[PDB]
Amino acid sequence: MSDNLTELSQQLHDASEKKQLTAIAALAEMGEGGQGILLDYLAKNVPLEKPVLAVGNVYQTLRNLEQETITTQLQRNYPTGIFPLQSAQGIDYLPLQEALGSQDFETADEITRDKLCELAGPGASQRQWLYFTEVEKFPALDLHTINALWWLHSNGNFGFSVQRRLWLASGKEFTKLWPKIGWKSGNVWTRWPKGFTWDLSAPQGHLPLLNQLRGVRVAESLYRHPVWSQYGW
């Protein structure tokens, strides 16, 4: 047992950020010894000064074991998660992190729409859509925090940064991007969203949702926002 653990541990620490995930999955299933190695790795790499996907996968893989002991220990040691919940405008992202850590993407998606409205300010509360002019004025730090959380808790498959990359690969053509991320034309709402896939079986880039009731302008403004380049997304 010790041989594999040592090998797995060495992979987790030193292999390329491509083979780390493989070792994390195996360690999780190596009982207390493997989970212990995962826990020590977190302790040595948290809090994060930059989003590091392996750290998010280590934390989330441990949460996904759904063991009271492990979850409780993680709550005690990382009460606000593994990424500083920074805001430039007094926004509280703890409930968003908590929903993501519990893998409740539907609630995380609702909280995220509520936070973008909170950021937009006055007369956006409870609104089911943003205006592109509100998006252009969002602070970069908050969008970085929101995106980092989505990304770190979805093995890098969810997040506006992911949508933006697919958008760039689509030649910036929304008609090609939408089928790629699973947002069917005409599946738009005025009161509540329906027909989406609020779990990881969804396509890469599927969440967070951007209502297309008003067309592509808000998404374009968001993907063109300076935060992505600014923070290396």
UniProtKB/Swiss-Prot annotation:
SUPFAM superfamilies: ARM repeat (SSF48371), GUN4-like (SSF140869). GO terms for molecular function: tetrapyrrole binding. It comes from the Bacteria. Transmembrane segments: none annotated. Coiled coil: none annotated. InterPro entries: ARM-type_fold, GUN4-like, GUN4-like_sf, GUN4_N. Belongs to the ycf53 family. This is Ycf53-like protein. It comes from Synechocystis sp. (strain ATCC 27184 / PCC 6803 / Kazusa).
